[PDB]
Amino acid sequence: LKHIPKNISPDLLKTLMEMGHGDEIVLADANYPSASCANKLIRCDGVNIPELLDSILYLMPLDSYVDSSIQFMNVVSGDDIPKIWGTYRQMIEGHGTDLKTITYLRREDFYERSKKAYAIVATGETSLYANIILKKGVVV
Amino acid sequence: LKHIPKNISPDLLKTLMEMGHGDEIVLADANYPSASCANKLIRCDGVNIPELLDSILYLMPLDSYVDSSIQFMNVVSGDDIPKIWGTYRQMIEGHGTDLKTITYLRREDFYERSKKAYAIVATGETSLYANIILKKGVV
Amino acid sequence: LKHIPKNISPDLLKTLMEMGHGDEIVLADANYPSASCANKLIRCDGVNIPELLDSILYLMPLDSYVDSSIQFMNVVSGDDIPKIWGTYRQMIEGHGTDLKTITYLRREDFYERSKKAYAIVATGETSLYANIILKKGVVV
Amino acid sequence: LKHIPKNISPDLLKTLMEMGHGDEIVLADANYPSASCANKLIRCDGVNIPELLDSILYLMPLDSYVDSSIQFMNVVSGDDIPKIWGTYRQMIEGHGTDLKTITYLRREDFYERSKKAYAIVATGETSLYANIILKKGVVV
Amino acid sequence: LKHIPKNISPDLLKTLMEMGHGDEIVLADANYPSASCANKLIRCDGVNIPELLDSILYLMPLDSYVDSSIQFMNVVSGDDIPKIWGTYRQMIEGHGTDLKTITYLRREDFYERSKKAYAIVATGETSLYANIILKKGVVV
Amino acid sequence: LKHIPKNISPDLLKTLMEMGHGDEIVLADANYPSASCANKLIRCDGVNIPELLDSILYLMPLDSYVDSSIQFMNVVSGDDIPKIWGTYRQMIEGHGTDLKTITYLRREDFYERSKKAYAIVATGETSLYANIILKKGVVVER
Amino acid sequence: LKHIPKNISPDLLKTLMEMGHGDEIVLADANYPSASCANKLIRCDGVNIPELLDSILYLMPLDSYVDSSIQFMNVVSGDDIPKIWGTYRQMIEGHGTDLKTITYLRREDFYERSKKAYAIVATGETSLYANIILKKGVVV
Amino acid sequence: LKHIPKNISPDLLKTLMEMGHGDEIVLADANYPSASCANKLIRCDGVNIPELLDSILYLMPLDSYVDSSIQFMNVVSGDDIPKIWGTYRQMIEGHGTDLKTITYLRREDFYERSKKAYAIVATGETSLYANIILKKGVVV
Amino acid sequence: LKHIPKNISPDLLKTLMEMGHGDEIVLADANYPSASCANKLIRCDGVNIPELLDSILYLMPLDSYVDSSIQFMNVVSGDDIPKIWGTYRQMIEGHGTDLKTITYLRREDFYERSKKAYAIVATGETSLYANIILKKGVVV
Amino acid sequence: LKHIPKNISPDLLKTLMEMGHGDEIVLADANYPSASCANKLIRCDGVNIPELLDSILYLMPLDSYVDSSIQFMNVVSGDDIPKIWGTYRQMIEGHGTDLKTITYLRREDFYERSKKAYAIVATGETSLYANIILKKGVVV
């Protein structure tokens, strides 16, 4: 269609539309157990996470009513911090969100919040530890 | 159809009809997480709540055997009391329903009750904290 | 519910509502092969057709845009003209459609039309050749 | 069909047939939350309960292996004790069942039992507190 | 249940009641391609046809409005006239139906009609050419 | 969501999205046989068609590869020409579509084309002969 | 089919086959509540248990890794220990199983174990307390 | 299970059982468009055709009412004659079936007969032109 | 996974594997009516056709039993020959296919063949007339 | 398809692909209760476990983030150590994985683990105690 971001599947848009204030969506990397965890699965194997996050932030406001609307997955000790978080931070600040609302959950904590999320979008993102949890806010 | 309100959808009327004494129905605003909470989902994305409440009250009696047959979602203290509540109130009293039956639920409590409800209709009501739970009476 | 005839079921009211101008519904007697002809089946095995026709006529205008809004199934020339037709004619008139709209269809014509109808209603009408096809009109 | 009562529906018969020793079936009045409680829902919106109870008892024996094979719904004070109970009792004896088998569950207890029942039939019964639960017996 | 013949399964009785006037049902021996022909399939692999025929004709009237209300499968010329046809005739007479109504179809016509019937019941009947096609009549 | 017309329901947007070039969609009025004709049914019982037409024209280009990308349902005499057709014509021109693309179908023909359409949306439009068929055009990268 | 007991239905064979070591299948008499207890239901309404048990014991080895691979339903006083238990033991002995493997479960314990069984088959066995639970062993 | 050939899956045996006189099942090599042509699809991707032909010939009698019970795919007039046909012919006379019942179809005719067949089993057979159509006969 | 091209969704791979000789798959551009035309629909809204074509040709042989294993959609009138046709041509040669196997279909004929294809994959390819139909060959 | 192990079924490949880091898959022997334990069942009745394990190890890396990514079912000792274990070890070491990751689970613990596995693949492995639980690692 005209005016809608080009990297959003028909089904993704529907689920973004039907999501209400408080509903969470996981943007999972190519390595995340998306199918096994998901309440509702959306497959987007041909899309990396930076470009997808940008489009969703364009469309979907974030929950200001909580302290933490965005969550990443904290690494296991010995593993390196993915540099991709810098792209996320750069993007998140872009659509005028305060970077303070990001918090870090550990692997098992993350796995569990994704199960309670309304949908997981399986991406093709190769970067390790690239999983993002987004919480929908109120629409103006 | 003749003699039936024009803003009650086919599927909404079916579900109102099959509802029994005690069953609850949520009238959710545009911002409510309707789809994620619904046991049974009706979308009326083009209808506003006062208008839909009016039609529902005409058709469906409210539960006399409980202290509270109506619930709103309570605001965070001490934020502004939603203006539309007045509209609702003036319509609830009118169908002959005592205002002292309305009750206010914490966001979390409201969510939990909506999951146990028979159905949630998702409306286009743009106003905040505009949600309502209704409990069916006897006919 | 209030203001809605007590002899119209949840599913029947839904289908009456979603019917539009021209759609046909079949009030079928107990002997009619409703299930095998039905595009969409609605069972009301405890209801008779007089009651039902009355309630339906109350909510749903007939099709003014054709010669025939109503069709009974004809007998096999001409053994015992069914008494129940008389009861139908009384209601159909003073509701208030013109009795001249009723045409009578051959068995195999009726069967065939009933398959092209939107829905059939299986009733408990024990009378013979008691079936009816009604055509929805324009609501204004 | 011949030799089968005319007011029990196709899916109703299959249901009574497939029930076995110990299974319960609720015959619910027009005000019961049948749809929302039913494990399995049979709709008979045109039928009243006394005629239905008569047909079922004809086909289905009641459980002798428990002290209560029938339950009614008790009134909340101050509602009227419905007259229909008298019709029910009069009809339950006359099939030969000892009226001592009838017990009286309060509203909330009744709902919870109907939930663990194999099937609920939503009737057209207008009388209040006209709900019945029947427990299937042994055949031989 | 009480008053229902013991060899009519729950789903068979249902389909028998769902059937209207003119509807056909095929009683298929254990060599018939039941599953591949059936619009709707009922399996009674442990039942033989003559006893099934008895119960069905007991419960269901035959179509007395057409030339043939019953069809068997004619043998491929040469092969023996199956004995069971005798047993069927002594079954059909009794229940008061005239054997003049039995017509005989050839394999590829018997297959064709069975596809258009409302149901095929697959039985355990080991005898050859034991297939019967039944047409439902009026219930009064 | 932001930047999306607020009268386009979640399922309608999906179906507008999954439509490609040549696909058609029917905006059916309240009296229309939407449910019986529909390959794929979307119910928007609370929406009027001019509102919906503006939002759809905003997002979805019309098919330039055919003469008629828009069809109305012609009247039988003596029904009146509906006023809403002006409203539609006003709307269509202004999104940049030549009114020459509008053609008119006999009630009967309209029904049959609606059965071959990708989707019918049932609206709350009480105005008569208010049905439209729109045929999706190519979306070209700027 | 050749070389396959005639009294095993298409769907029963498949269930027996997809059962692994330790899975249980219940052979239920005509009075049992099979439909309501079953995780997976197979209907063999025209077959008695004796015949069926023989075929199943011909095809399916019994679990030798537990104390008891066969459970009958024990009676409640004062009912009679049914004669069919005699018929069961050889077949059972006759297929080579040590009868000490038969353990007896009371009514409620039987229903609960059957709810946990991979499948229940509803038979036509009019005899009482004829239900049997079988536990599949290892093949070679 | 005991007394069942070991290379027939649970679903294959069921489909082999529910087939009746005249039904056709296709044994398709790894390269055959099984998924697209199948009315009913059974997958046996780890199984070669000769051993499957063995078991099926053992369990399933072939149709004697036709001159041709078996169809191979004939080669494209350019391609080479497959070794596997000799295997097949030897397999076919071993059970008492005359090789004169074998016929050969050109791809087009083969594709079409397969669509009209009750089932296609997609096998792992590597040999080209390895496909077989078997038509079931009567069990006595 | 290791060794599988990174831009193939789990479902596309399945589709590719279950396709056999002669089956056709349509790589559809972002303007194609993919959903209304597809018998089986795989969405890859995040992939462009060149990268998809490349990894598909790696896995899947083309049908050499026909003059044309590849079909493009010829432009109307009218507009330019898209440059991506050069890109496809450079890839098709290199994987070892004779470019003469490419034929060009009029818009309506392409649509019609795609209705007959096993599957259509909806890509995010923004180039016009970028659609490709591939026919599967034999393997190894 | 080319470059893909020949013993991986279309849905198995899909399953392996849709699995993510941490997801488990049971390779279950012919005696295992796959059907009854399986959250998601893939049937591969024709295939043995070593050839299948080998192919899967080629495609799927094992989880490095736990102390044990491979589990066998331990013997009831009771029975003796099955020789199929060494064959497994020869394989998993040949794929670069350290044999100190194999743990051993008791029969009941293995059943429970398998219920919580993403998929169970039912094999034709005739070796006893031959079941394997693989846990998927990260792909770099």
Ligand SMILES: C[C@@H]1O[C@H](O)[C@@H](O)[C@H](O)[C@@H]1O
């Ligand atoms: C160790 C982590 O496992 C998770 O499942 C993945 O989603 C992360 O990228 C990372 O590999």
Ligand SMILES: C[C@@H]1O[C@H](O)[C@@H](O)[C@H](O)[C@@H]1O
């Ligand atoms: C803050 C509240 O969030 C809720 O989910 C909404 O339903 C209310 O309208 C309000 O926006």
Ligand SMILES: C[C@@H]1O[C@H](O)[C@@H](O)[C@H](O)[C@@H]1O
């Ligand atoms: C002869 C007629 O057949 C029809 O199917 C029935 O609906 C009528 O009642 C009558 O029996």
Ligand SMILES: C[C@@H]1O[C@H](O)[C@@H](O)[C@H](O)[C@@H]1O
């Ligand atoms: C108070 C009681 O509520 C129940 O649900 C109904 O079944 C009774 O008839 C009565 O209305």
Ligand SMILES: C[C@@H]1O[C@H](O)[C@@H](O)[C@H](O)[C@@H]1O
């Ligand atoms: C030759 C005939 O084929 C039919 O399909 C069977 O139903 C008959 O019993 C007979 O065997």
Ligand SMILES: C[C@@H]1O[C@H](O)[C@@H](O)[C@H](O)[C@@H]1O
């Ligand atoms: C007479 C016409 O019937 C059609 O079905 C409707 O869609 C038109 O709006 C009008 O009412």
Ligand SMILES: C[C@@H]1O[C@H](O)[C@@H](O)[C@H](O)[C@@H]1O
């Ligand atoms: C009392 C027992 O009830 C059980 O459900 C039945 O299976 C027995 O046959 C017996 O009637």
Ligand SMILES: C[C@@H]1O[C@H](O)[C@@H](O)[C@H](O)[C@@H]1O
């Ligand atoms: C050329 C032939 O194509 C067919 O589809 C396949 O089934 C044969 O094995 C062979 O490859």
Ligand SMILES: C[C@@H]1O[C@H](O)[C@@H](O)[C@H](O)[C@@H]1O
């Ligand atoms: C005119 C053509 O229509 C087709 O459906 C599209 O796939 C092409 O890219 C082009 O736009």
Ligand SMILES: C[C@@H]1O[C@H](O)[C@@H](O)[C@H](O)[C@@H]1O
């Ligand atoms: C005793 C064990 O039981 C399990 O179910 C099987 O999977 C093993 O192979 C073995 O037979």
Ligand SMILES: [K+]
């Ligand atoms: K996708």
Ligand SMILES: [K+]
């Ligand atoms: K809606």
Ligand SMILES: [K+]
């Ligand atoms: K009903």
Ligand SMILES: [K+]
């Ligand atoms: K059966």
Ligand SMILES: [K+]
């Ligand atoms: K398989």
